[PDB]
Amino acid sequence: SVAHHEDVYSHNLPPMDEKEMALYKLYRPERVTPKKRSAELLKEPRLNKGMGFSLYERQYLGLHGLLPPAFMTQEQQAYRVITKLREQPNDLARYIQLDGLQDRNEKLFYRVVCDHVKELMPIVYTPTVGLACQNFGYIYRKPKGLYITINDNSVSKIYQILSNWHEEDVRAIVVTDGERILGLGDLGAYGIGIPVGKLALYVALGGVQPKWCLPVLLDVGTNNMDLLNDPFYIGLRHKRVRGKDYDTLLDNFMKACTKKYGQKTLIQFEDFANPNAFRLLDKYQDKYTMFNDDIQGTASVIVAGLLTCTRVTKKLVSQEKYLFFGAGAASTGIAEMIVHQMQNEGISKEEACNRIYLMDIDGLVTKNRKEMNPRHVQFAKDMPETTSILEVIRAARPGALIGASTVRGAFNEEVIRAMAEINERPIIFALSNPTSKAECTAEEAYTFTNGAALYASGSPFPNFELNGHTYKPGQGNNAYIFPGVALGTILFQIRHVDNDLFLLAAKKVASCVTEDSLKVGRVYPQLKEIREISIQIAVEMAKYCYKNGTANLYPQPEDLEKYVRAQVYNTEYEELINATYDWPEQDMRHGFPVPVVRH
Amino acid sequence: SVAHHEDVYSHNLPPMDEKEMALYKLYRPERVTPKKRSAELLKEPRLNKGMGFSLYERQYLGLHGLLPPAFMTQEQQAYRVITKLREQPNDLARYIQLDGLQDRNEKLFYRVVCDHVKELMPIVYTPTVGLACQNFGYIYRKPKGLYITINDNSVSKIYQILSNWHEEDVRAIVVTDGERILGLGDLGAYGIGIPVGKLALYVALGGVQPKWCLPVLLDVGTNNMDLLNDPFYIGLRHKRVRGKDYDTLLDNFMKACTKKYGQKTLIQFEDFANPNAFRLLDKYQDKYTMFNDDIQGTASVIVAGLLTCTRVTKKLVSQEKYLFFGAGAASTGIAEMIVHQMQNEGISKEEACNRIYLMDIDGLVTKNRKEMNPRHVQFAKDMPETTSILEVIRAARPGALIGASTVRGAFNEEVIRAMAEINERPIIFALSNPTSKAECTAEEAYTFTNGAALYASGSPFPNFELNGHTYKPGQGNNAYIFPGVALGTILFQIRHVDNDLFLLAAKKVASCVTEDSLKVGRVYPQLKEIREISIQIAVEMAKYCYKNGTANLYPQPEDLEKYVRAQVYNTEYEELINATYDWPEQDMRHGFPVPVVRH
Amino acid sequence: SVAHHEDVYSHNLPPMDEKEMALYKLYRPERVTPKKRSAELLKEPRLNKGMGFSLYERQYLGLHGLLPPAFMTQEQQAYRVITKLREQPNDLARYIQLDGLQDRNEKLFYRVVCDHVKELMPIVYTPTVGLACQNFGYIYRKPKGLYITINDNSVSKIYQILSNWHEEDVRAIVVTDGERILGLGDLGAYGIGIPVGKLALYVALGGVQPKWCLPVLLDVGTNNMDLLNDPFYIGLRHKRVRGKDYDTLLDNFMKACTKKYGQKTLIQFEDFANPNAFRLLDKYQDKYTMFNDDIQGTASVIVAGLLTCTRVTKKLVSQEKYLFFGAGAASTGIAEMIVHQMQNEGISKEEACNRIYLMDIDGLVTKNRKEMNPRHVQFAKDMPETTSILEVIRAARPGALIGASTVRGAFNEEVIRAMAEINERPIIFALSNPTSKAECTAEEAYTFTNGAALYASGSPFPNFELNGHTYKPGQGNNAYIFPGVALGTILFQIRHVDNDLFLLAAKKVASCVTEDSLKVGRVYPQLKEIREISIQIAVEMAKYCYKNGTANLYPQPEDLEKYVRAQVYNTEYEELINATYDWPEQDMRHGF
Ligand SMILES: NC(=O)c1ccc[n+]([C@@H]2O[C@H](COP(=O)([O-])OP(=O)(O)OC[C@H]3O[C@@H](n4cnc5c(N)ncnc54)[C@H](O)[C@@H]3O)[C@@H](O)[C@H]2O)c1
Ligand SMILES: NC(=O)c1ccc[n+]([C@@H]2O[C@H](COP(=O)([O-])OP(=O)(O)OC[C@H]3O[C@@H](n4cnc5c(N)ncnc54)[C@H](O)[C@@H]3O)[C@@H](O)[C@H]2O)c1
Ligand SMILES: NC(=O)c1ccc[n+]([C@@H]2O[C@H](COP(=O)([O-])OP(=O)(O)OC[C@H]3O[C@@H](n4cnc5c(N)ncnc54)[C@H](O)[C@@H]3O)[C@@H](O)[C@H]2O)c1
């Protein structure tokens, strides 16, 4: 136990100024002792260290004899997981393994996932998670999410469901109705893995506290005819409900969630069907602490890449011209975001939209159009209708070409050749996923540009080498934005997340691209730097929000960066046994303070 | 179970407009099912109904056989408590009984205390609680409060203590170092009953949720020499610590409390030694959600009585002159508050203070003074020094005489006679407690004024009858203010409680005095109306705070009064068994949805 | 933590030989770490030490800040308890404070009761408990008993009620229907305090573990019209059911208890109407591990009193003649127990029964009787019909006179004088309770005898000095027997408790009466010696039961006494935190 003149768990600390010491004590995480013992404790992911538990810890907590007689450090444990991970037959087996790990030892999980983020991020989420939902069907696991259906339609019924969740301090919810699982379509009740995976990244990459996370899946039926014929499907068996009832369910859901955990609860929508996703985002954006990653996340990730490219094309975003091959969700969102930015660059919403050209399945988006999207309207151009990329490239001679259209190789040798001709360093983004859907590859983009192009894709491509120079193409991964945006929104209790905040994030991501990463064609920082980036974004979001009064955390912390670093998740094993401390010897005595005569 | 087209616990409801229905569902309290069974449940005050549990409830929750085979309604139970209460030998025995009831059946407790508020308020708190601390010494009871000592001096040590408290959603803390227990002095560690009692009133009179309340006692030693000689005293055995250490303890305490439950946590100081109480209030008032009832509560209660008297003396507070016999905490605070009010009445801080005269043990407070309190300075008058009340009454001919000085009968027949002569209806307040310390009695004040005086006292006096007219003198009980101020501060998360808010409260209390109560000499509403008054004050505090942006609850509720009524405590027994509800018959079926051939 | 070559909690142990150490480790109580923390732990009487918890314990168990900042020893806490106790206005108030203590800190409760046994026994049980039930009505307390009614009449319905109890290892149950609470009658559902009190003595006096105890009250209604008319009564508001339903409820109760806790579960009946007491005992005696203290306990304690008298009358129990004034449940029981004792001494059931003279309200018991009790018959004498005791004392000139009949001062100077005349040291027992109803006081017994009488009563009498010689008459308190009989039955899983065992208990109590206590005229051991007496009784019971194969505990423990002492309750606080110990330095290392 600690001396009477010392504080608890304040050993071996860095030299500190009296004022510095107080701030540290005020911000630092405090020890939390669990109520469970023995097997009940070993089965709690958040507490279980497995063989990482020392012998004293085991005897004290009633764990001794329940674990094999071997003792391990967390590094050794992480080693064992990594080894076994790489011996798995395929990516799906690794997914199943990691999911099991998250349910067994949460500290080890995030330890492993954070140490090999590049190697495992596509397993934990990216493309493997959806493949798992589709191929395994119902996956055995501990209750790591909630299923709320169209038959639980009311504030009370959903409130009771949330009440069955084991944590009371929920501050971040990721929801999906599983109608549009990224690159697979309507998977219904099988989509529960998506919210789980996303939240896993919030923690791994954002530093968000795991106890604050809740995966939710809304089941209003499914339109995937296979599932409805599948005798194993475990979701509601009928096509999707879409009337007012669907609208009411979501309304009651947002209400129930905030009624239970408070209005500041961050609710993020995932994999909704495009149309719904945009509507829903528009309906709740200013009424709740909500945001849709597929839409705003994408927009922000790309703009951050374009903003980083700015440092090479020596041309400001407002001094550039963009040509989007594809006019769907991704492209449309990225455009509107590029516009906002331009206006914040001392320009009008006239010369802004006039600098962006969109091409859809029916060629260029001109004005003589019939039945076009209201969002495309402000981008339509008063020029000749055409379906040729090259022709559009020649007419407007854009500064950057962005691909967000299903079409593979839609960016042929000629198109790449043209872009180089008109620009010393042409920006070419092949976003379509997976790589087999890419408008063009890294190799193609570099070679057909003699190595001058600025390339970025949605999926990972191998590093290319041209004329003695090496190139390491990047990826416009949403994971660069949402983690940080989520962290900052939570720690400072931002009432609403607007485009400006996403823009701030993009600018932050761009600012973190090193000069070395830029000398290798990388317009995106390294994935392993997302935790530090997230912290930086959180601090930046704070300054900006306390300035315009939208941050609810009162009062504004003295030192923002220090407060944030003290709030983020720590993969290291913590002490679970109360810290003891002495009192002045005289006051710790057992017995009558003043003598009496015995009866 | 409920039908598939119905909602849970939505039976027999008042006719509602679709829009009205939604608001109701959004605000209404939701059912909460407990995790404990059998004896563990019976021992939980917040869940235990005793024989109020029906037979079905008993069998379901594993309670059957643990309670006698008799079934009771809550009214019958309340009846039994009341009967037994009145058969007790003295007030102390009743206190002990009620304390035991609070630890056995919380619903029944507040049911009983609320139904007979006039008869039991002085038992639960007012004067009996302090007598109990002093006479019983250590009182056996369940752990209903926390002891934090000078030997637990650090954010972490206090954090760990708060962590041992069974509730995580604490929103209201009442603390005391027990140095100045009202009318008894330094009682040290024995003062734990004070915070407990005060919080009990928050709930009984304010409608504050009991689960949000936490009684705390700071033990820095004691100067009461008897206790230090008492072989039974259970507090730290040494005189009070007062250096920087005392200052640090309180600093770490406010930090630890907000670090644990959040910055919005209402922390109210109780029974601190006058000097400390004022300093501490000044140091934290603008840094935390804090307030000191003895100081601000008093000030506000009295001003509310003076404001109600305004409706008779047809003279505004700023069109009146006050003479305080006594210049201590109570009087000084009430003065400064009367000033604030006057300034809000279109006047300056010159003509304001000039309308208030203060008398202390050394006579009138003039200017030729030596070593006087800095707060008295602005009230000192440039007139002749004197010790005669009558003489001061004659010179300034005040409109109201307020007594807040130990001296019994300090308001003699002549003094009362004088006040009547100079004023058609003279305001005379005898605040000193108990009645045996009153500057004068109700009988005295009425008779010696032919029944024209406006009297109010700190302690309860019997109703008097003069010349065929009946009078029911009131009491300037703090309980009229703090409950409501606490409720509103909590529900709307007001960042800081300022004088304006207390003034708003006083004006509210005054506004609730009926015309009948005014025709009987009552300048204070009935004690049984404090719950409704508290709600009214909460709503008023909301409007005012959303207007100047100090209310943190976001967003401002649509209907303030409805939101508040849905938040207040309800003494009625609630259901503890989950509500069940049907799903569409087809979706509730057990079995393969699509036939398969058996293996 | 302990060294790798040391066992846990084995420091400062007495010198022991290899084998002695082994048997000590095999028998010793092991530490048991609780699962509750903070307020939940403080609210468990069996774990709560209150302020006796040290600062470290408080920080470890999450209790710090929940208790005041003082730290006490158990002794210092007992002191505070006794002080408050003696300051109480009356015994009833002392009862209420003790009941609250049992529900607050169990170890302290027993430390206090065990230290001041003679002072508190009558508060915890004896006479005050019945008064508390009658006067207070429903008393506020933690759930410390179970109510089973005529409406929960099925093996399953009772099983579910027993399943609501907080301990699974129940081994002793004391049940009552409250019809005949000693000295007060029918108090219905208010009678739950009796079982609670009886079990409290099981622990305090017998050493029985508290967690094994389960108090129960069967509510089948009440005939106490005042309770039925009282709007504050909390029991079934109707009279007592007695049909096949009652007997069915009792049969289901016995089945449910043994199905739930095992056939070995000891079930003791208390304060039942005499007819039900006897009928039920006769019915379950050899079917379950059961007994009724009022019947057998009484019978046993009194015989132990007589046996002790033998040492002074140089006359064997069989070489004596007894005269019972009053032939109710008490006398008839003692008679039959005495008989059983005579037979085990070599004689037959002939001289035995011919050595006992019974009298009821209608004078002596003459064979010319009409409508008499079946149990009585075998004691009925073929002599003249008289009503005067003197006329009976003078006729059969008995060596002992035993009073068990409401009548106060039934033994007048002429009655006693006649005994002193016929016997050098006449045996005079006035059992009727309370004192104000005693057949005759001690001052009377000794005076009208010239300090030559061997006297005892059911209620206490101050010490009496006569001619320089002091006298300290004893009480025939059932507490000398049931605690030990219970301890022994439980620890060794004795299938059935019969006369032989109670007699055995009787002989052990008698043998513990010192010579000095005998010179002062006290024929019963000191009350403070009951715990040791209980332990010796269990040992003796074990020896007897293993020999006749009625002890189910397998195998017979090696050292009966060491085993017993290792099992009895210990009032001292125990460590609640796990003992830690090292492994070889190399086997604790973390890492590859
Ligand atoms: N950060 C990222 O890297 C990221 C984020 C989100 C989506 N994406 C990828 O972007 C792509 C598009 O996503 P989406 O949600 O906008 O789909 P979408 O259906 O909403 O949009 C597709 C658009 O491309 C047009 N199009 C289709 N076939 C075409 C053809 N042959 N020629 C020309 N135009 C054609 C369509 O008319 C439509 O405007 C996907 O491959 C998706 O995986 C990447
Ligand atoms: N709402 C209420 O009804 C209410 C609230 C708080 C306090 N009180 C009562 O007010 C009284 C004063 O409280 P306090 O905290 O200000 O005590 P205090 O010690 O702070 O003030 C007492 C003042 O009276 C003066 N005084 C004393 N003896 C005097 C005498 N003989 N003649 C003239 N002046 C004299 C002192 O100099 C001092 O200025 C107490 O009796 C207290 O119970 C009533
Ligand atoms: N351990 C003890 O010390 C102890 C144990 C059991 C009983 N007792 C006492 O023994 C007494 C009787 O106990 P019980 O359970 O047998 O009650 P009981 O009703 O069964 O016995 C009463 C007997 O006394 C007879 N009787 C009554 N009034 C009489 C009179 N005026 N003259 C002659 N005979 C009369 C009755 O006919 C009957 O046989 C009680 O006072 C009881 O407290 C003491």
**Does residue B447's CB lie within 6 angstroms of at least one atom of ligand 2?**
no
H/E run at residue C233: none
> Residue C338 carries which DSSP code?
H
**179-238 of C, contacting B, C-beta below 8 A:** 189, 192, 219, 232-237
B578 within 8 A of B31, measured Cβ to Cβ: yes
B210 and B320 part of one domain: no
CA distance B323 to A356: 78
Q: How many CB pairs under 8 A join A and B?
A: 104
Is residue B596 domain-resident? no
Q: At what angle do helices C329-343 and C298-313 cross, to 10 degrees?
A: 60
**Which one of C450, C477, C504 terminates a domain?**
C477
The encoded tokens of residue B112 equal: 């009983």
The encoded tokens of residue A476 equal: 């416009």
How many Cβ atoms are within 10 Å of B382's Cβ, its own excluded? Answer: 8
The encoded tokens of residue C186 equal: 């029918």
CA distance C66 to C41: 11
Cα of B330 vs centre of ligand 2, distance in Å, is: 6
Nearest CA in chain C to A37: C35
Instruction: From chain A, pick out residues whose CB is under 8 angstroms from the CB of C70.
Output: 593
* Closest CA relative to residue A32, chosen from B343, B340, C37, B335: C37
Strand blocks (E) in B312-426: 322-325, 356-360, 363-364, 400-403
CA distance B360 to B404: 10
How many Cβ atoms are within 10 Å of A415's Cβ, its own excluded? Answer: 22
CA distance B457 to B465: 17
B164 within 8 A of B259, measured Cβ to Cβ: no
CATH number of the domain residue A230 falls in: 3.40.50.10380
Cα of C185 vs centre of ligand 3, distance in Å, is: 14
* Closest CA relative to residue B216, chosen from B259, B272, B262: B272
Residue in B125, B202, B233, B246 annotated catalytic: B125
B140 part of contact set with chain A, CB < 8 Å: no
Is residue A545 domain-resident? yes
B510 and B410 part of one domain: no
B317 within 8 A of B342, measured Cβ to Cβ: yes
Peptide bond into C584 cis (omega under 30): no
The domain total for chain B is 4
Pocket of ligand 3 (CB under 6 A): C 274, 298, 301, 326-330, 360-361, 404-407, 431-433, 437, 458, 476, 478
- The DSSP code sequence of C252-269 is HHHHHHHHHH-TT-EEEE
CA distance B486 to B265: 11
Residue type, C313: T
CA distance C121 to C479: 9
B367 and B262 part of one domain: no
A307 within 8 A of A342, measured Cβ to Cβ: no
C132 within 8 A of C98, measured Cβ to Cβ: no
To the nearest whole Å, the CA of A107 is away from the closest chain C CA by 17
H/E run at residue B152: none
* Closest CA relative to residue C67, chosen from B164, A576, B168: B164
Residue type, B128: T
C244 and C389 part of one domain: no
SS3 state of residue B422 = helix
Cβ neighbours for C243, distance < 8 A, ≥ 6 positions apart: none
CA distance B161 to A485: 34
CA distance C257 to B268: 54
A15 and A45 part of one domain: no
The encoded tokens of residue A371 equal: 């039945």
B68 part of contact set with chain C, CB < 8 Å: yes
CA distance A550 to A363: 42
CA distance C292 to C49: 35
Strand blocks (E) in B405-529: 427-430, 454-457, 464-466, 469-471, 474-475
Nearest CA in chain B to A220: B587
C76 part of contact set with chain A, CB < 8 Å: yes
Q: What backbone torsions phi and psi does residue A148 show, to the nearest 5 degrees?
A: -120, 120
CA distance C329 to C320: 22
Q: Which residues are bridge partners to B269 per DSSP?
A: B175, B292
Resolution of this PDB entry, in A? 2.3
Q: How far is CA A478 from CA A108, A241, A475, B274, in A?
A: 25, 30, 9, 59
Cβ neighbours for A540, distance < 8 A, ≥ 6 positions apart: A488, A504, A505, A508
H/E run at residue B551: none
* Closest CA relative to residue C175, chosen from C92, C258, C299, C298: C258
A62 within 8 A of A37, measured Cβ to Cβ: yes
* Closest CA relative to residue C268, chosen from C341, C175, C165: C175
CA distance C428 to C421: 13
C588 part of contact set with chain A, CB < 8 Å: yes
A535 within 8 A of A561, measured Cβ to Cβ: yes
Is residue B54 domain-resident? yes
Is residue A27 domain-resident? yes
Cα of A507 vs centre of ligand 2, distance in Å, is: 64
A228 within 8 A of A222, measured Cβ to Cβ: yes
Residue type, C455: Y
Is residue A599 domain-resident? no
> Residue C498 carries which DSSP code?
-
Q: Is B211 a catalytic residue?
A: no
C286 and C153 part of one domain: yes
Is residue B138 domain-resident? yes
A74 within 8 A of A114, measured Cβ to Cβ: no
CA distance A381 to A530: 38
Report the atom number in ligand 3 closest to the C-alpha of C434: 43
Report the atom number in ligand 3 closest to the C-alpha of C406: 41
Alpha-carbon torsion, ordered B280, B283, B284, B287, to 10 deg: -170
How many Cβ atoms are within 10 Å of A543's Cβ, its own excluded? Answer: 13
CA distance C312 to C426: 10
To the nearest whole Å, the CA of C424 is away from the closest chain A CA by 43
Residue type, C281: L
Report the atom number in ligand 2 closest to the C-alpha of B457: 3
Strand blocks (E) in A392-513: 400-403, 427-430, 454-457, 464-466, 469-471, 474-475
To the nearest whole Å, the CA of A167 is away from the closest chain C CA by 19
C512 within 8 A of C573, measured Cβ to Cβ: no
A380 and A272 part of one domain: no
Q: How far is CA C390 from CA B525, C267, C357, C369, in A?
A: 82, 43, 13, 21
B359 within 8 A of B327, measured Cβ to Cβ: yes
CA distance A154 to B21: 12
Residue type, C277: A
* Closest CA relative to residue B416, chosen from B426, B408, B406, B424: B426
The encoded tokens of residue A410 equal: 């839609």
C189 and C327 part of one domain: no
Q: Which residues are bridge partners to B216 per DSSP?
A: B146, B175
**Which one of B115, B143, B171 terminates a domain?**
B143
B379 and B231 part of one domain: no
SS3 state of residue B185 = strand
B126 and B255 part of one domain: no
Cβ neighbours for A70, distance < 8 A, ≥ 6 positions apart: A51
| Residue found by looking up tokens 């400006």 in the block | A500
Chains that touch B (3 or more CB pairs under 8 A): A, C
| Residue found by looking up tokens 């008295």 in the block | B376
A544 within 8 A of A556, measured Cβ to Cβ: no
> Residue C71 carries which DSSP code?
B
CATH number of the domain residue A123 falls in: 1.20.1370.30
- 3-state SS of chain A: helix, strand, coil percent to 5? 45, 10, 45
Helical residues (DSSP H) of C512-554, grouped into ranges: 515-519, 530-547
CATH number of the domain residue A416 falls in: 3.40.50.720
**Which one of B423, B458, B477 terminates a domain?**
B477
Helical residues (DSSP H) of C116-238, grouped into ranges: 117-124, 128-136, 155-162, 193-201, 225-229
Q: How many CB pairs under 8 A join A and C?
A: 75
Peptide bond into B14 cis (omega under 30): no
Q: Helices (H), strands (E): how many in chain B?
A: 24, 14
CA distance B486 to B171: 10
A30 and A109 part of one domain: no
* Closest CA relative to residue B550, chosen from B463, B598, B488: B488
The encoded tokens of residue B231 equal: 């072989």
Cα of B423 vs centre of ligand 2, distance in Å, is: 25
The encoded tokens of residue C458 equal: 């059911």
CATH number of the domain residue C7 falls in: 6.20.310.10
The encoded tokens of residue C402 equal: 């035993």
SS3 state of residue A509 = helix
Q: What backbone torsions phi and psi does residue C324 show, to the nearest 5 degrees?
A: -95, 120
B123 within 8 A of B191, measured Cβ to Cβ: no
CA distance B253 to B256: 5
Is residue A90 domain-resident? yes
Q: A24 is in which domain, residue-wise?
A: 1-35+550-589
CA distance A360 to A373: 11
Is residue A496 domain-resident? yes
- How deeply is A13 buried, as exposed, middle or buried, from its count of CB atoms within 10 A (0-12, 13-18, 19+)? exposed
| Residue found by looking up tokens 């505990």 in the block | C553
Q: What backbone torsions phi and psi does residue C361 show, to the nearest 5 degrees?
A: -70, -30
C440 and C371 part of one domain: yes
